[PDB]
Amino acid sequence: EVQPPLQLPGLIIFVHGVNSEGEWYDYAERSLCAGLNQRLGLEGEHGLKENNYEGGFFVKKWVSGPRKITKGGDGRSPVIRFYWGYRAADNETDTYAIPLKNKKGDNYYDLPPESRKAKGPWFWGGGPFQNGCNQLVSLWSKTGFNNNPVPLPFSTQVLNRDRLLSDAPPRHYYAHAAGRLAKLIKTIRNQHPEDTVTVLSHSQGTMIALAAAAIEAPDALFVMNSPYALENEPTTYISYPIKEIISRKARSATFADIVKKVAENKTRLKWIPEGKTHNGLPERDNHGTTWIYCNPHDRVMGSSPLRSIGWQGLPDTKDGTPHTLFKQAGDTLYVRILGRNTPCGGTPTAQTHFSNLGDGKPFWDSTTTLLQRATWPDPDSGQTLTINAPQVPEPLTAEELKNFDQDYARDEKQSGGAGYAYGQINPETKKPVDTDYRYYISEEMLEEVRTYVQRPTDHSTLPSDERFMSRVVAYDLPIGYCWHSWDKAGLEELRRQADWLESDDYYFSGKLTVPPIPPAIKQDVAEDAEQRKAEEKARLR
Amino acid sequence: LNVPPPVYGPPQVIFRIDDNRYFTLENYTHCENGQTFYNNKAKNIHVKILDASGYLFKGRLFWLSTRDDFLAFPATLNTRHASCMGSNKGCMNAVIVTTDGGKRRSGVPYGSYTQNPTGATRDYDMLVMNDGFYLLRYRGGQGRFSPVILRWILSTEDSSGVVRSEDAYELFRPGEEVPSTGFYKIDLSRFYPKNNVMEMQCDRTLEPVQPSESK
Ligand SMILES: [Ca+2]
């Protein structure tokens, strides 16, 4: 045996999204560790390696594996796998027709009512789904999603009255989860002062991460496929309450002040930025940076209700001048794009193509009908992006990404039991197509249409991409100047505090601890009371 | 609609266990589709194993099982064509396990959720022993170093026929006190086959082209 030291270069916190249990966690971790190992010259037993966790199993019916390290699976990894979700109260479980599962992985709607809630606190990992939002103030909302007369779509649900769109519970579980994250960061800084804290968020989790930045900003923030929108779309007008319809200047100021709060931590006692890589590029100290990763095929973030920065990034003005937010947040705000026929990690460009992707194909993968184009409208004519992010030693050629925007593998009719559709069994792996099915299905017509070939939505493509993390994001991470031989069980305590199934009293009892709204989060409502009626009248038709 | 009938290529071996036992891919348009059958000329066996091409598995496979009634074969999805691509969770490869000779088939999922089912196989080793099968997933960057070992063994209490044995890591001195990181690294030359075949191979020359539908 040969027992080497840890010496990690800054901790990383993975923040998942909605109805997600960190699917992209494992193999963003693997790729990012390999990228760091090449970037910093680590080799042999000294190199970093990913953790390995226990997989799922049958009891049959799928069960999410226990969040425990597998035998001999503890590796040299700086990843803190954060987790969050929503738990039902001790007496108010089935008021919200939303998916619910216990820790052991049992469907609430599959057990007798008298047995239900005897034990196994009911919850859903990552929070409902129909409850996202495009601003930070809505995380403190006393009111959940209301379905009463496209609004809040999130794939995993048929398109073209209101099946699964039951009225969602209040959104405190967002802000509360953000407070937990803002705890862990500050908790890390208490235990460890000269190390680096990186937050790596996805989907709705970005808001949670962003809210923790306004409380305790980390040394680096990464937002992948964020629902943050600097303008209130008509759907935002008709859905959100008057209190949570935030003005354009206020949303931009909120983001800018969060980037400044994160950029505050760019001065520490002095990797060595006196290093030039094998490709002639200078290694960069990425302290206090905030990175926006966008996917131009995101069927969730490109949909007309959102059209957020996780899809279009920070687009350019009508005359080519870069986005106004760049000057607001300063020189520590960066943007990267990951789409088909588009280089990622190359030389920075001023007007990077967005609406004309450059291969003749339409902007939207197989979007032809009037309703489909109404749900996913093409971006404005000639929209452009600034990619001010640095270059990487091995960037992604547009030819490598010519196949990156997925589509219907086969949209023919399905047999009923042996096919490739939601509630079926992949005839190759003998495994269900989509597992969540069971925790969702709760004459046969409707249940007989539970074979809708769900359209691939390029939402998890960006975080799961091995090439993007290993060759771009790895170099985009900051590294503290003085590494620290890490602690035996201290780091495991951090992971325990991250997993809310192991430390959140909200999961054990239900005691929400909602933090107050930080000063960086503005609540300046736009004069929209009349404008809400304008969009409301159109729905009457 | 008025579909034209497809032409399939001739059966070709993609993993040769030995002289008598071999895996044949047949009823296919190219090396990334079709079905894979298990063949034993002595017992005159010809049963289906995968409804997909076994060439997608780019890892290594070491067949030490002498039993024609227990079969385990890696079910790997195609990155370019699969219904789980783009899905918010991704894809998950698995192994097809039969304990009745091939009539009843079951699927044991392994690995992590990914957007590259074939790309994950390039990091895997799989041993098929008489008593079950072992999967080694290599961690780190370059090289096949620092593996995590997952072991499955026969049981009659489960529908699959196999269940995970926690007592794995018997590949390297079964009393060596496995640590938290886990044996950097492990030698499999004791399992290296006599014919020196480890990866799945396919001959694209037998892929049948067809110039149909000029308009
Ligand atoms: Ca797609």
Numbering used by the authors:
A (entry chain A): 38 to 96, 116 to 205, 210 to 220, 223 to 332, 350 to 521, 558 to 656
B (entry chain B): 58 to 272
What does the paper say about this structure?
Here, we report the identification and characterization of a Tle3 phospholipase effector and its cognate immunity protein Tli3—an outer membrane lipoprotein from adherent-invasive Escherichia coli (AIEC). Enzymatic assays demonstrate that purified Tle3AIEC has a phospholipase A1, and not A2, activity and that its toxicity is neutralized by the cognate immunity protein Tli3AIEC. Tli3AIEC binds Tle3 in a 1:1 stoichiometric ratio.
The Tle3AIEC-Tli3AIEC complex structure could not be solved by SeMet phasing, but only by molecular replacement when using an AlphaFold2 prediction model. Finally, the 8 complexes exhibited a reasonable geometry for a 3.6 Å resolution with R and Rfree factors of 23.4% and 26.8%, respectively. Tle3AIEC shares the classical core of an α/β-hydrolase fold, with a β-sheet of six parallel β-strands in the order β2β1β3β4β5β6. In Tle3AIEC, the catalytic serine was identified in a short loop between a β–strand and a α–helix, with the sequence SHSQG at position 265. The catalytic triad is located at the bottom of a crevice ~30-Å deep and ~20 × 15 Å. The core of Tli3AIEC is assembled in three stacked β-sheets of 4, 3 and 4 β-strands, respectively, with topology of β1β2β3β4, β6β7β8, β5β10β11β12.
